[PDB]
């Protein structure tokens, strides 16, 4: 019984023992690829280990980055948090400026902007652009064949029964794959908190645009006089709104004679809704902020003020030293 245990143990032990020394020696001479410092990104990655990203090895995020040969968001499994962590190892990311969605600046739907002729070919926007630019009356409007839907990877665009695309705000993640795929340069990126957008891209004069479409821009310039914060400009016979200076006063919406500016009149009208706790009866708002809308006597707490005037810009919400005024949107509907 002694030999039957001694011989196999000895043979297998010798075989195992020589191979360990052989592999330890083979660690040298052969592969010495340690020269990229590995322990950079091996914990922020959730871990899938699949060959659908490049990166020959899921721990290869140590030589793929320091040369700019790989994209920051090359890992879809890791997502925004993992990409932000990887970038903030070097910096750049972990920033600000909220989130954006995709919008269509056009509102002509197969009945207000009809077709000049009939088009034969493939049902695609670029294929239609081959056939002399399309068969629509307006040379700047939506063709309606849905290239942007075909290029969207997250399934956020659906083509409505009226011909214009609709974007789901919960499935769209702030990319531009549908922006450079539009032949008409119509798809654009807009902040999710914005509700006042000029929806037209027509660069013709008044009479031709009036003949072409029902809700066209005629470059009358009446929307610039109403605005006082210098946020909307008329250039190339078309109006455009700057979103960095727009206070959403809803003043230009009612003045457009052709209904090109989006939004409904439900806004503001809250002149000095002041919380009684943290105001010292300063009375600095009684004098003037460009409209009067406050006039009273000292205004000891609680404030006695009638609310039937003012435009609701929002400057009086941050210029106070204590910020005792509260902004609440309360109107009809």
């Amino acid at each position: 019984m002694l030999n039957a245990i001694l011989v196999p143990v000895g043979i297998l032990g010798v075989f195992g023992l020589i191979f360990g020394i052989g592999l330890a020696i083979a660690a040298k001479v052969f592969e010495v690829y340690e020269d990229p410092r590995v322990p950079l990104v091996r914990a922020a990655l959730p871990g899938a280990n699949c060959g659908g990203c490049g990166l020959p090895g899921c721990d290869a995020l140590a030589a793929n980055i320091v040369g700019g040969s790989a994209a920051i968001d090359a890992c879809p499994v890791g997502g925004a948090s993992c990409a932000a962590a990887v970038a903030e190892i070097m910096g750049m990311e972990a920033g600000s400026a909220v989130k954006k969605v995709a919008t269509v600046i056009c509102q002509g739907t197969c009945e207000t902007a009809p077709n000049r002729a009939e088009y034969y070919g493939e049902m695609d926007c670029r294929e239609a652009m081959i056939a002399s630019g399309g068969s629509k009356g307006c040379r700047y409007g939506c063709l309606g064949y849905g290239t942007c839907k075909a290029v969207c990877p997250f399934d956020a665009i659906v083509i409505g029964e009226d011909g214009l695309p609709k974007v789901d705000p919960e499935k769209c993640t702030s990319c531009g794959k549908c922006v450079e795929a539009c032949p008409k340069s119509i798809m654009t990126l807009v902040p999710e908190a914005q509700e006042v957008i000029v929806k037209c891209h027509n660069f013709d004069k008044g009479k031709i645009a009036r003949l072409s479409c029902t809700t066209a821009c005629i470059a009358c310039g009446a929307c610039v006089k109403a605005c006082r914060f210098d946020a909307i400009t008329v250039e190339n016979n078309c109006a455009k709104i700057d979103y960095d200076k727009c206070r959403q006063c809803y003043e230009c919406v009612d003045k457009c004679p052709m209904n090109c500016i989006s939004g409904d009149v439900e806004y503001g009208k809250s002149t000095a809704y002041i919380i009684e706790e943290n105001c010292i009866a300063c009375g600095l708002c009684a004098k003037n902020c460009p409209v009067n809308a406050i006039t009273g006597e000292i205004k000891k707490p609680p404030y006695v003020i009638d609310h039937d005037m003012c435009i609701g810009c929002g400057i009086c919400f941050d210029k106070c030293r204590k910020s005792a005024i509260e902004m609440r949107p309360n109107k009809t509907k």
Binding site: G16, F19, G20, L23, A24, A27
Partner: protein, 196 residues
């Protein structure tokens, strides 16, 4: 909480045969009957449980340079013990699965699970993971074997169904009769995953 999730990942969510597509040689080789698949699944389950527990017990002393030689020794020892017991007590199953019983050591799902979930977790999670993977393997093998046997022999579990004059489709018990069938099954699952 953390024990039931590991056990129930298993069959439905991460099926080795239908969702990971691993261990395709025994699946296409032995599933000509409803009995061979169950025995192969049970043997693979025992080997997987033993190897996972043994590897997870020693995840502190094995360096990263001699890892695979250290793993294959344990896997081969368990496979050899199971094969000796099966040859001692169940000769018919050993004869029906002659070449693939020594080949359980290289099954594409034992080493992968050992690398993934055994060298980084505890002892209690690996046991549940092995049980779930073995159950999924056994169920998939049984389903494929029954589907092939009904068409290619006209009987289920040795019990005839279509009479004594039935002429079977003798391609389903051939090497080309496996691939196609499995492919169709996978397609069906994908459809019922993506339209729901």
């Amino acid at each position: 909480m953390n024990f039931m999730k590991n056990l129930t990942r298993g069959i439905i969510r991460e099926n080795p045969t239908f969702v990971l597509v691993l261990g395709m040689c025994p699946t296409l080789a032995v599933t000509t009957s409803a009995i061979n698949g169950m025995g192969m699944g049970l043997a693979t389950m025992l080997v997987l449980i033993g190897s996972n527990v043994a590897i997870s017990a020693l995840r502190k002393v094995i360096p990263d340079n001699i890892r695979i030689p250290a793993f294959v020794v344990v896997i081969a020892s368990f496979v050899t013990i199971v094969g000796m017991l099966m040859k001692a007590y169940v000769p018919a199953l050993d004869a029906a699965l002659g070449i693939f019983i020594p080949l359980i050591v290289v099954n594409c799902i034992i080493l992968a699970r050992a690398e993934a979930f055994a060298f980084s977790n505890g002892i209690a999670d690996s046991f549940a993971d092995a049980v779930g993977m073995g159950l999924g393997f056994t169920l998939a093998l049984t389903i494929l074997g029954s589907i092939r046997e009904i068409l290619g022999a006209g009987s289920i579990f040795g019990f005839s169904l279509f009479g004594a004059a039935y002429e079977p489709v003798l391609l389903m018990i051939l090497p080309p009769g496996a691939f196609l069938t499995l492919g169709l099954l996978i397609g069906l699952i994908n459809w019922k995953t993506k339209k729901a």
